[PDB]
Design a protein around this ligand. Structure first.
Ligand code: 98H
Lengths: 245, 8
């Protein structure tokens, strides 16, 4: 039965944790909006081998996930859960969190994402050979851009993306349920205080993030079966652990 | 696991 002061202290703790682990400051991403890949640079990316483009993207994704791991480490209540449950939650939620975080680096006006120093369209990623997945991820970021999340809202929402008591394999489900509820109280309190409860009905359907993650695992299966040695030799060990079957 | 290591 967390008190109002405890709920308020949770809001602050979650928001602080996100600030410390956000990977790139929002202002930096916004400042870079006019730095867009040229037609020649786009073509250069498109003409990369499938293996090199997958390898680059796997490294960048691993980097982004490492920040999400640090977010969880600092998240009030997460370290209180048993070791098994920490693992279950991060293994399922890490990628979901990255997909939400991406909207900050997404410019809806020209439908570009910040990638390797400049903004580029989904055409940048053609060499991967998973255009449907990329389009679905860009559609997802475009949908989130319409919500106009503040930094604090992203912090509170990504905490809830991670603390999801519906994941199978939890040893202490009721403990996770209790933390989830308190984080829900923290989110809703912050939203009520800022007149932003209207966003709740517009948040992605919960099956959405799961679906994007399954699609990503499936596209890696297609790539890995075609280039198994490249993945074994060159891909980050954390990436394989999280995503390979 | 690696997640275990990264978490301590
Ligand atoms: C095939 C595979 C993946 C699908 C391809 C894309 C969907 C994916 C490749 C690069 C990546 C990982 C990426 C980000 C989120 C997704 C993308 C663009 C964000 C935008 C997230 C957080 C940030 O603010 C920065 C730090 C700006 C990064 C930059 C960044 O390199 C790999 O399995």
């Amino acid at each position: 039965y967390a008190s109002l002061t405890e709920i308020e202290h949770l809001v602050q703790s979650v928001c602080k944790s996100y600030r410390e682990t956000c990977q790139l400051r929002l202002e930096d991403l916004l400042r870079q909006r006019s730095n867009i890949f040229s037609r020649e640079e786009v073509t250069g990316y498109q003409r990369k081998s499938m293996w090199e483009m997958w390898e680059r993207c796997a490294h960048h994704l691993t980097e982004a996930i490492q920040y999400v791991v640090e977010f969880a480490k600092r998240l009030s209540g997460f370290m209180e859960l048993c070791q098994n449950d920490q693992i279950v939650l991060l293994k399922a939620g890490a990628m979901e969190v990255v997909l939400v975080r991406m909207c900050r680096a997404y410019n809806a006006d020209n439908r570009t994402v910040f990638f390797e120093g400049k903004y580029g369209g989904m055409e940048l990623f053609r060499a991967l050979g998973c255009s449907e997945l990329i389009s679905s991820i860009f559609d997802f970021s475009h949908s989130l851009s319409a919500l106009h999340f503040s930094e604090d809202e992203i912090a509170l929402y990504t905490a809830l993306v991670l603390i999801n008591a519906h994941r199978p394999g939890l040893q202490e489900k009721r403990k996770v349920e209790q933390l989830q509820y308190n984080l829900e109280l923290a989110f809703h309190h912050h939203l009520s205080k800022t007149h932003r409860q209207s966003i709740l009905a517009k948040l992605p359907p919960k099956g959405k993030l799961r679906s994007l993650c399954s699609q990503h695992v499936e596209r890696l299966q297609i790539f890995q079966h075609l280039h198994p040695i490249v993945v074994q030799a060159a891909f980050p060990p954390l990436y394989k652990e999280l995503f390979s079957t | 696991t690696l997640l275990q290591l990264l978490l301590g």
